Design an enzyme around this catalytic site. Sequence first.
Site, PDB file in Angstrom:
ATOM      1  CD  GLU A  35      -3.074  -0.782  -0.003  1.00 54.10           C
ATOM      2  OE1 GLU A  35      -2.990   0.266  -0.681  1.00 54.10           O
ATOM      3  OE2 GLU A  35      -3.963  -1.636  -0.199  1.00 54.10           O
ATOM      4  CG  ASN A  46      -8.631   6.405  -4.386  1.00 52.02           C
ATOM      5  OD1 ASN A  46      -7.646   5.695  -4.571  1.00 52.02           O
ATOM      6  ND2 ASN A  46      -9.116   6.655  -3.169  1.00 52.02           N
ATOM      7  CG  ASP A  48     -13.734   7.703  -5.780  1.00 57.76           C
ATOM      8  OD1 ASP A  48     -12.618   8.179  -5.503  1.00 57.76           O
ATOM      9  OD2 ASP A  48     -14.377   6.993  -4.979  1.00 57.76           O
ATOM     10  CB  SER A  50     -11.911   9.234  -2.499  1.00 67.82           C
ATOM     11  OG  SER A  50     -11.492   8.077  -3.200  1.00 67.82           O
ATOM     12  CG  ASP A  52      -6.500   5.137  -1.138  1.00 70.11           C
ATOM     13  OD1 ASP A  52      -7.693   5.384  -0.879  1.00 70.11           O
ATOM     14  OD2 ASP A  52      -6.148   4.199  -1.890  1.00 70.11           O
ATOM     15  CG  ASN A  59     -10.871   5.784  -0.435  1.00 69.20           C
ATOM     16  OD1 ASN A  59     -11.075   5.044  -1.408  1.00 69.20           O
ATOM     17  ND2 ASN A  59     -10.988   7.084  -0.504  1.00 69.20           N
ATOM     18  CG  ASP A 101     -17.455  -2.036   6.650  1.00 63.49           C
ATOM     19  OD1 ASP A 101     -18.140  -1.405   7.485  1.00 63.49           O
ATOM     20  OD2 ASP A 101     -17.642  -1.956   5.415  1.00 63.49           O
TER      21      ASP A 101
END
EC number: 3.2.1.17
Length: 129
Positions: A35, A46, A48, A50, A52, A59, A101
């Site tokens: 990562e 990202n 979209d 967003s 990280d 995110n 989650d």
Amino acid sequence: KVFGRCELAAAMKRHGLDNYRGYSLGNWVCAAKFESNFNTQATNRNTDGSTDYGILQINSRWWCNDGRTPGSRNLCNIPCSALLSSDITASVNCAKKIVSDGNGMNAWVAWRNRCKGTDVQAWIRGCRL
Ligand SMILES: [Cl-]
Ligand SMILES: [Cl-]
Ligand SMILES: [Cl-]
Ligand SMILES: [Cl-]
Ligand SMILES: [Cl-]
Ligand code: NA
Ligand SMILES: [Rh+3]
Ligand SMILES: [Rh+3]
Ligand SMILES: [Rh+3]
Ligand SMILES: [Rh+3]
Ligand SMILES: [Rh+3]
Ligand SMILES: [Rh+3]
């Protein structure tokens, strides 16, 4: 801060990630490697809009507030900048919420693609843990 492999393993262990939700420490170290290359200051945008953040590339779409991700949430109740600290507390605490989650560590696409099913124990080999 760019952690050493064993240094990061030790910090992750102290913060309770070893076997958290059933994921051995090597899983967490492998995820961090791919990562962020163990760099707490890592950021990546990202598609979209967003971003990280940090050692586990958490995110802004769901987990932290960065003020520039429309319609997003802040489920870890933290500024995304907290995830860039030399102290990994905020990243670890948020990671615990993410991995709980429903999807486990599949939430981290680099873990699914590069760590899942591999000999992750290799990532903690040699460390005084
Ligand atoms: Cl390494
Ligand atoms: Cl392991
Ligand atoms: Cl926002
Ligand atoms: Cl905030
Ligand atoms: Cl799971
Ligand atoms: Na957000
Ligand atoms: Rh162990
Ligand atoms: Rh253990
Ligand atoms: Rh994407
Ligand atoms: Rh501390
Ligand atoms: Rh610490
Ligand atoms: Rh082995």
